[PDB]
C-alpha cells in the first residue's frame with residue numbers, strides 16, 4: 001500500500017456537508033462511504049441522499065442518532081437516491097423513497113474492519129473510504145482548526161465520520177460540520193496512539209460498503 005492516500009485526489013469524495021443541529025452524523029459518514037465505493041467501481045461521483053436514510057432507515061432514529069452499519073445495510077437492500085432528488089431537511093419526515101425521482105445507487109454488502117487495529121484500518125482506507133467513529137464532544141475537537149489533532153479527547157465515541165485518506169502520522173477524515181470547521185471541513189487525527197481504540201476512539205468501530213465492478 002502507498003505511504004499516503006487521499007480519496008479526494010482520486011475524485012471519490014464530494015464537497016463537505018453541514019448536518020446542522022440534527023443528530024444525523026450516521027447518515028453523512030455512511031453516504032460518504034457509499035459515494036466513495038460507487039466512484040471506485042463505476043467511475044461516477046454522485047451526491048447521495050442523507051435524507052433518505054434519515055427518513056427510511058427504520059432501525060435508526062433520524063435526528064436522534066443512528067447506526068452506520070444499518071445505513072450501509074439499507075443501501076445494500078434498497079439502494080439510495082441522489083441528494084438532488086431527495087434533499088437534506090435536517091428533520092425526520094415520512095419515508096418518501098418510493099416517490100423520489102432519478103437513479104439509485106445500490107451496493108452489494110457491508111464489511112467491518114477488525115477493531116482497535118490501526119494497520120487494518122489503514123489497509124482498508126488504501127482500498128476505499130470508510131465510515132468510522134470518534135468522540136467529538138470535547139471542546140478541543142469542537143474547536144479544531146487545523147494540523148494534526150492528538151487530543152485532548154477520550155474514547156467515548158459519539159460521532160460518525162468518514163475516513164478518506166491517511167499519511168505517515170495521520171488519518172484524514174471528512175466531517176459533516178461544514179467547511180467552516182477544521183481544514184475546510186476535514187480533520188487529521190494522529191496515528192500511533194497509546195489507546196487500543198486509537199486517538200479519540202478512531203479505531204473503535206469501522207464499517208464500509210461493498211460493491212462489485
Ligand SMILES: *[C@@H](C(=O)O)[C@H](O)C(=O)N[C@@H](CC(C)C)C(=O)NCCCCNC(N)=[NH2+]
Nearest residue numbers: 023024025026061064065066133157158159
Ligand atoms: C452523531 C451526530 O449527529 O453528531 C449522531 O448523534 C449519531 O448518530 N451518533 C451515533 C454515534 C455512534 C458512535 C455511531 C449514536 O449515538 N448512535 C446510537 C443512537 C441511539 C439513539 N437512540 C434513540 N432512541 N434515539
